Symmetry: C3
Subunit: 147 residues, 3 copies
Amino acid sequence: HHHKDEVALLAAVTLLGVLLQAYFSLQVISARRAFRVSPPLTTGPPEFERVYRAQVNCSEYFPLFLATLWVAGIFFHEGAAALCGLVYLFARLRYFQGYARSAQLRLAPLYASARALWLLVALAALGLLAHFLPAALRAALLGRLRT
Amino acid sequence: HHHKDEVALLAAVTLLGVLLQAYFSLQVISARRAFRVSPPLTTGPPEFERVYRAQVNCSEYFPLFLATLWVAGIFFHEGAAALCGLVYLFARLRYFQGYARSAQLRLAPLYASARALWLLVALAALGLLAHFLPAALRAALLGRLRT
Amino acid sequence: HHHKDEVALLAAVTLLGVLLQAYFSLQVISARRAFRVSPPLTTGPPEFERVYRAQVNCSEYFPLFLATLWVAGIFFHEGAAALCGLVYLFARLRYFQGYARSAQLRLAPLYASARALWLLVALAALGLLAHFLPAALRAALLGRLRT
Ligand SMILES: N[C@H](CCC(=O)N[C@@H](CSC[C@H](O)CCc1ccccc1)C(=O)/N=C\C(=O)O)C(=O)O
Ligand SMILES: N[C@H](CCC(=O)N[C@@H](CSC[C@H](O)CCc1ccccc1)C(=O)/N=C\C(=O)O)C(=O)O
Ligand SMILES: N[C@H](CCC(=O)N[C@@H](CSC[C@H](O)CCc1ccccc1)C(=O)/N=C\C(=O)O)C(=O)O
Ligand code: NI
């Protein structure tokens, strides 16, 4: 008996996220050509540094997204976690698109991505609490008994 | 019944990757000493910034590698995924070695690493498709029936 | 039968790590306000670049921590891995706090975090070795037999 069925949506969202990250990377390389910035060195016109920074930030947050997605999806509910992941990834795509154009336009999609990530965190926290809190509470009651 | 046996190669490749990352970090610190760059601050002679950038880029890609490795290894085939992972990690080591010497010498091993990563992605995609596409197709046919 | 029970501590430590990372990010944003640095652009007074760099470095190491934690926890022992993870995360929090104040004060907690990470690596290595080495040794003996 395989557990592929229990995690296939998490794996699919994860893969979509990877693909999206690849997209961000290629867009940064395209900004390296457009605005004549050769490796190493990550300075140039404002628009390049903005595109670059959007990609860097997405990259920095991508493992946080994965960790919470998987923990939430396993401990709370797979579908909810996957949905939140989709909302997050769409929000991040919009973030990247915004940032590339103007610092201010990254902001609205940025906020959407953060809410989804905290929602993933809260589900993770609730799921873990549901797992640990009953056994812990019971053990404390047993000692209290005793009398 | 443990599932260690089904994922031991993925875990081994993962650990090798971690070790390799540790190696990149220590090489960067060594460049910080050689070329007199004290923390914080990541600017100095060209050779330091190149070594530094090789490490940074490897670090940025390392979670993408892990995600696709695991998804491909679970959904498609463990051995193939591990092999691709080994090729990728070797390619990245060569990338780092190249970059440290000259921007242009990172390029050949860079290309090898990218092909292996996309190969991992394609296996992940195929594996997930194999999981989801039949059930989805059947459900669509059932509605078509109906008549 | 679920395997949540076998990985719940790893998941909890992982989530704590995510929360800690969120904390580092918010502290960096607070340094962006205090020392008047607007996005993109990551240069300003020394204290901002130090806080920023502490966060960046923690972020760079966070997936390495996760990978080894999970591999060690599954292949060697869950509790040991979780404990090492807790020590690591506390060490990193202290690292961030130190760095924010002075480059030199990040150093003591930095060393604590590295020992814990290498301890995780060693457990991962030992666990994987325990899994692979017997079967490999037996296979070699069988060929030796033969005679
Ligand atoms: N800081 C920017 C970041 C952009 C980037 O990292 N682009 C990739 C290359 S993009 C080629 C393909 O998109 C490969 C990425 C990929 C991602 C997920 C799955 C498969 C492939 C890259 O240059 N990697 C290493 C290096 O800088 O030498 C830069 O300097 O290039
Ligand atoms: N940007 C470069 C990056 C190199 C780096 O990150 N080196 C490590 C230290 S290298 C020591 C050992 O190699 C620990 C790393 C390790 C990795 C995987 C498993 C076990 C240990 C480090 O300095 N970490 C935090 C900090 O900058 O304060 C730098 O400024 O140091
Ligand atoms: N280089 C620093 C890094 C700090 C940082 O990344 N802060 C977060 C925002 S902090 C808001 C919440 O803390 C969300 C983070 C979070 C982490 C884990 C779980 C849930 C939420 C951020 O700015 N992200 C994207 C962007 O720069 O546009 C900077 O320029 O902001
Ligand atoms: Ni099972």
